[PDB]
Amino acid sequence: MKHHHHHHPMSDYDIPTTENLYFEGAMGFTGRKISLDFQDVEIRTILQILAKESGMNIVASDSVNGKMTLSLKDVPWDQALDLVMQARNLDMRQQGNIVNIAPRDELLAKDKAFLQAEKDIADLGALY
C-alpha cells in the first residue's frame, strides 16, 4: 500500500504496518522445552524421539549414524535439534509436517543420484 513508496508499494524495508492480532504473548516455538538425558544413545534414535515429542513427523534416514550423549534442561527440541544436527552434520528435508533427517553426506550423494525420482505420479521403486 502507499505508506511512503508508491513505487514498489509493498512495504518491506518501508515497514509493514500490520494490524496486531494481539502479538503480545503469542510467540512460542515449534516445540516445548525438553529436559531429558540420553547418554550413549545413537543419534538416529534421538531424532525419532524429537518427532515423538510432538516434533512433527521426522524420519531419520538410515544413513544417520553415530552415538551422542545429551543432557538437556530447559532446552526446547527446536534448539536441541540444532546441537544434534551439527554433531554429525545432518540436514533436514522438510516437506510438509514430515521432515527427513539426512546426513549432509547423503545430501551430496543425492546430487550424484537422481534428483527427480518422480516424473509421473506412480509409486514404484521398492528397492533402491
From Swiss-Prot:
Compartments in which it is found: Cell outer membrane
Domain of life from the UniProt record: Bacteria
TM regions (residue ranges): none
Subunit structure: Homododecamer. Tetramer of trimer.
Role, per record: Required for type IV pilus biogenesis and competence. Could function as a pore for exit of the pilus but also as a channel for entry of heme and antimicrobial agents and uptake of transforming DNA.
Other known facts: Present in outer membrane vesicle formulations which are used as vaccines in human.
Family the UniProt entry places it in: Belongs to the bacterial secretin family. PilQ subfamily.
Name assigned to this protein: Type IV pilus biogenesis and competence protein PilQ
